[PDB]
Design a protein around this ligand. Structure first.
Ligand SMILES: CSC[C@H]1O[C@@H](n2cnc3c(N)ncnc32)[C@H](O)[C@@H]1O
Ligand SMILES: Nc1nc2cc[nH]c2cc1Br
Lengths: 625, 296
């Protein structure tokens, strides 16, 4: 299902045009709302007093058709940044007139060009409109990958086109966009309609638009090549770009006249559809994670909170994770009990944070696989989950499993443990307070005992997403700090973003923690080399864990365990976006902090410019001990 | 006949060609009209011929005596021809080759070829006989506001644009365009001097330019200069039109001789009678055909 539009600047009979466009397969029609040559005076007589009607009637279509099928277009003569004062003033009046008429019709979106550098007054007038009436039309800023000036034929004898690479210069249309949306205060209603030229620029120019709110991709008829049977297709380079845009679920707009004159108009659409069918289908992670793309959620705190039945059901749905846990205990049981000792030596296993018992069942399956005897304790502090365990224990497990309705840091254990097995790790490894929990459980691990996991290590990477920056910004609430939303992590399936440097490890914790003078507080400095011009909006956080020896789990994208989907990446935003030039180092500083009651993260960017320290003293975000 | 009169051009025998758009209301179409009696214009029922086009008329021009070359909103450059009797107007071709509104059209000196400019940024050279684009030029960086064919040289023409370039073209060169302040809106070649042209800007200045070496200029209008039309005299006068809703006729040195505030909407075309060189006809979006008696 490619959602598809037709761009026209010529609409003689509105109903007939729309009807032809509907028969062609298009879901909507971009068109002007006043006639695009009908230039209008507002100041000077006699033309200011021109008899109306000033445009077509709203009665020509249904309200439903205006709301679903029609995208308005700003008239191309409207130049609010003209060097001529009178064009400036008439264009101001005319812009507000056209916008207000689109709002009167209830149009779902309205198109405006960015076709020069200075759109400052166009932004001002759009902002004026935005704060006038209560409506919710989208504003699609029509901006090209490559400026007309920079794709022109090399045919002016005395003004040759530059044959030198200009790295920043070739990205100029991003700066047109950036400056526009910055001026308009990052309104959710202002999106990009990215216009694709016949010749794509360098990859870095395209990459520049990663993490931008691209709602439309405009495809001119001129950019389509012709295949041996006469029909429209695209180059493999353009196809690459289309597959990326499809992943952003943009609406594709076809603009310009039919040059492929042998075939039906359907053809252009049929190619996009052809391309849409022939992508690689969604992998079982991407199938599981559909809907959650860039949806911010609170990180779960299974310590502070008692997790719901269905949350445990979700945790349990990851058979890769448990076959790994099973394998880690399997390999461990063999390493601890030799073959000749197998009937003498019953290993005391303790599931610390047993939930509804998947690790308990993995421990049973592993022991029968290993052919070694085990004594199970299932320690769980959530008394709701303990109901599930105790029903499981009576019906199935029996006396082999002892259920313990207790905190692992309080529990006075009847004996010491050969192996402690746990599953206390969030998306940043230590953000559910596994260090503190296993530290207080450590006194009943045997002197030679194993923790599964033995180790885990968080990873961070700087990102750009103006989309995700907006999502965070929209989480302002009543009755708290108006910036608290920027000073807290979010679990999010990051999707429309740009990873700006390779992830690096942040914090590591090892279990057992044999170190005499224990401290789980941390301070880390990371220097991230950046090869692009960009804007930093936060740090994606991942993790890795050693269950036992080579048996590992990871959500670090480059080493991601195949098939594992229990965790999404975490996101640490910053309050103010940071301009990062090509070749600069992003320096981030992260702290893990604590008192008796709370654990929290603080963070700051120190290069190429200083941010404020975020979440100082846990003022916006704490993790309950 | 639709309200917004866009074009007005005389042929050799003093018959008036009108082009019109409906730029508002329900139907946004256009039309082409021949008046053998000029003083009857705009009146529809007392005219020689008339026809409905599918879309509006941004610009047109005569192709000698019987052909009508039309710049459409559709993207089509259209050739309509008069029949054997000159009472009907039949489409000979309508070729959808520009990707936006065709704004400006101009027939080249020989009359077998023409040049068209569009909002799509391109300038296209046409073979009127073969009905195809010979050459397609993306020299500009914005809308092509005006193209103007050289009177006597088939390979030469002027174009101007919203990128603030006036380009002198010469198809004989490997790099045909050559670049020659506020944006240029209208272009007119000097009829007697191959090396000279005038250009009107969006701020109401008319400027006089030699190809060798904005030299002489006058603030003629208060708003944009839409059109510039040299007279048929040996010592020609320059008619200048504007969005200020005024006609001015100018001398060699751009001094104000005649001035008409007769039009109440924008003045869109001008055309000097070849029967009487002192009569000048304008048309405007007020649906007026005003016949001015120029004190020559
Ligand atoms: C299966 S998700 C991790 C499990 O750990 C449990 N948990 C977290 N912290 C502790 C603790 N200190 N003592 C016992 N169980 C815990 C939570 O209740 C959860 O069921
Ligand atoms: N302890 C856990 N935390 C998280 C966070 C996302 N998925 C999880 C699974 C477990 Br088990």
């Amino acid at each position: 299902r490619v959602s598809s539009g037709r761009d026209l600047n010529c609409v003689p009979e509105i109903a007939d045009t729309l009807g032809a466009v509907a028969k062609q397969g298009f879901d909507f029609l971009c068109m002007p709302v006043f006639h695009p040559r009908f230039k209008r005076e507002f100041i000077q007589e006699p033309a200011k007093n021109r008899p109306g009607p000033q445009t077509r009637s709203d009665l020509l279509l249904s309200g439903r058709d205006w709301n679903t099928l029609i995208v308005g277009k700003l008239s191309p003569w409207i130049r609010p940044d003209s060097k001529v004062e009178k064009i400036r003033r008439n264009s101001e009046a005319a812009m507000l007139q056209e916008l207000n008429f689109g709002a009167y019709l209830g149009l779902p979106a309205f198109l405006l060009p960015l076709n020069q550098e200075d759109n400052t007054n166009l932004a001002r007038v759009l902002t004026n409109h935005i704060h006038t009436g209560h409506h919710s039309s989208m504003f699609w800023m029509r901006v090209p990958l490559v400026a007309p000036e920079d794709l022109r034929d090399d045919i002016i004898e005395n003004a040759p086109t530059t044959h030198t690479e200009e790295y920043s210069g070739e990205e100029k249309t991003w700066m047109w966009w950036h400056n526009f949306r910055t001026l308009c205060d990052y309104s959710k209603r202002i999106a990009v309609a990215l216009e694709i030229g016949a010749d794509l620029p360098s990859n870095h120019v395209i990459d520049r638009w990663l993490g931008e709110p691209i709602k439309a991709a405009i495809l001119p008829t001129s950019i389509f090549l012709t295949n041996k049977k006469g029909f429209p297709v695209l180059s493999k380079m353009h196809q690459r770009l289309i597959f990326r845009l499809l992943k952003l679920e943009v609406q594709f707009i076809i603009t310009g006249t039919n040059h492929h004159s042998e075939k039906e108009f359907c053809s252009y659409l049929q190619y996009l559809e052809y391309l849409s069918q022939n992508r690689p289908p969604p992998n079982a992670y991407e199938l599981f994670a559909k809907g959650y793309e860039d949806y911010l959620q609170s990180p779960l705190q299974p310590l502070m909170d008692n997790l719901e039945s269905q949350t445990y059901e979700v945790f349990e749905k990851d058979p890769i994770k448990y076959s790994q846990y099973q394998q880690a205990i399997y390999k461990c049981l063999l390493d601890r009990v030799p073959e000749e000792e197998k009937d003498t030596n019953v290993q005391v296993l303790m599931v610390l944070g047993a939930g509804r018992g998947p690790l308990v069942n993995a421990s049973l399956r592993a022991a029968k696989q290993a052919d070694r005897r085990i004594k199970l304790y299932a320690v769980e502090k959530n008394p709701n989950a303990v109901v599930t365990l105790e029903n499981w224990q009576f019906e199935e497990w029996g006396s082999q499993v002892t259920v313990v309705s207790s905190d692992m840091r309080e529990w006075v254990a009847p004996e010491k443990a050969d192996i402690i097995v746990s599953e206390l790790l969030g998306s940043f490894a230590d953000n559910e307070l596994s260090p503190e929990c296993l530290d207080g459980a450590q006194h009943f691990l045997k002197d030679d005992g194993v923790s599964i996991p033995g180790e885990y290590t968080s990873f961070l990477a700087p990102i750009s997403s103006s989309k995700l920056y907006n999502e965070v910004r929209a989480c302002r609430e009543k009755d708290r700090d108006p910036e608290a939303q920027f000073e807290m992590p979010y679990v999010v399936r990051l999707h429309n973003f740009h990873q700006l440097s390779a992830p690096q490890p942040c914090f590591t914790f090892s279990h057992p923690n044999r170190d005499p003078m224990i401290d789980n507080n941390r301070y880390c400095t990371l220097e991230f080399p950046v090869e692009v011009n960009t804007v930093l909006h936060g740090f994606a956080g991942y993790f890795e864990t050693v269950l036992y020896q080579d048996i590992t789990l990871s959500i670090r994208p480059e080493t991601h365990s195949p098939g594992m989907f229990s965790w999404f990446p975490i996101l640490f935003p910053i309050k103010q976006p940071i301009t990062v030039r090509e070749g600069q180092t992003i320096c981030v500083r992260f702290w893990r902090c604590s008192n008796s009651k709370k654990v929290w993260y603080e963070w700051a960017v120190t290069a190429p410019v200083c941010s404020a320290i975020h979440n100082p003293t846990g003022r916006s975000y704490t993790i309950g001990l | 006949m639709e309200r917004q009169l866009e074009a007005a051009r005389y042929r050799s025998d003093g018959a008036l060609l009108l082009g019109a758009s409906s730029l508002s209301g329900r139907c946004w179409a256009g039309s082409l009209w021949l008046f053998k009696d000029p003083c009857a214009a705009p009146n529809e029922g007392f005219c020689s011929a008339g026809v409905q086009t599918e879309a509006g008329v941004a610009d047109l021009t005569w192709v000698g005596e019987r052909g009508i070359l039309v710049a459409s909103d559709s993207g089509a450059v259209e050739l309509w021809e008069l029949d054997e009797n000159e009472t009907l107007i039949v489409s000979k071709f309508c070729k959808y080759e520009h990707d936006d509104i065709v704004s400006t059209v101009s027939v080249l000196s020989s009359g077998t070829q023409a040049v068209s400019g569009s909002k799509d940024i391109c300038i296209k050279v046409w073979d009127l006989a073969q009905q195809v684009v010979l050459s397609s030029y993306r020299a500009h960086a914005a809308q092509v506001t005006c193209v103007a064919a050289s009177p006597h040289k088939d390979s030469v023409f002027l174009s101007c644009s919203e990128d603030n370039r006036i380009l002198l073209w010469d198809t004989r060169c490997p790099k045909p365009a050559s670049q020659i302040g506020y944006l240029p809106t209208s272009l007119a070649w000097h009829p007697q001097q191959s090396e000279v042209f005038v250009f009107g800007d969006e701020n109401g200045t008319v400027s006089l330019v030699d190809t060798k070496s904005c030299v002489l200029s006058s603030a003629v209008h208060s708003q944009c200069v839409t059109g510039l039309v040299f007279s048929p005299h040996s010592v020609p006068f320059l008619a200048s039109l504007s969005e200020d809703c005024s006609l001015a006729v100018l001398d060699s040195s751009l001094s104000e001789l005649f001035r008409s505030q007769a039009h109440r909407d924008f003045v869109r075309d001008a055309t000097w009678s070849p029967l009487n060189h002192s009569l000048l006809t304008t048309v405007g979006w007020d649906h007026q055909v005003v016949h001015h008696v120029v004190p020559t």
